[PDB]
């Protein structure tokens, strides 16, 4: 039960402001370098 989240639970937190924070620039750099960075983000 502890540290267990259902699909509904996890989805709810998707709209959390902390879930809205964009990746750091280093990570973003790595994502663009791999070309896996989502377009128009």
């Amino acid at each position: 039960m502890l540290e267990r989240y259902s699909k509904v639970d996890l989805l709810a937190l998707r709209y959390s402001p902390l879930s809205q924070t964009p990746p750091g620039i280093e990570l973003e750099g790595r994502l663009r370098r791999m070309n896996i960075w989502r377009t128009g983000s």
């Binding site: 502890l2 989240y5 996890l10 937190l13 998707r14 902390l18 879930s19 990746p23 990570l27």
Partner: protein, 168 residues
Amino acid sequence: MKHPLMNVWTLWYLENDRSKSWEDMQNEITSFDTVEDFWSLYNHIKPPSEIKLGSDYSLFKKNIRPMWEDAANKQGGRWVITLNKSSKTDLDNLWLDVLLCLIGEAFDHSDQICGAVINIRGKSNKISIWTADGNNEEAALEIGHKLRDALRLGRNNSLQYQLHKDTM
């Protein structure tokens, strides 16, 4: 305030390149240990339907690598979901569901799960859940049947467990 995950998870991206070796095609992207940090990453990466052919996404915990050579996988095996008659978003949704099952720790034998891999190929796409012990039938079977539930797989979609190791 962030909600902690049971495990640290690491995203890996494989880009198929004839020049480099199987292991060297794999690229470690980032690690996270909270629900919020997961969504941050997931919202800002291309879905599986949009990545190059021959490429993989993989998510693994305990700093385990998506490689045969890793000790955590050597005695392990995997449930393999071959996707036939699946849409691009069916793929994206099924992959996302697998991710949520893993980071959510939805399995009773969550200790046995090492990670999940999605392979993007033209002939056939595959999503696999890697297990730590191939000989632990009860753990595999529980993970298998719950996976079939959480993913709500159709009859056309096949689910088969297999050992990583090549053995007679």
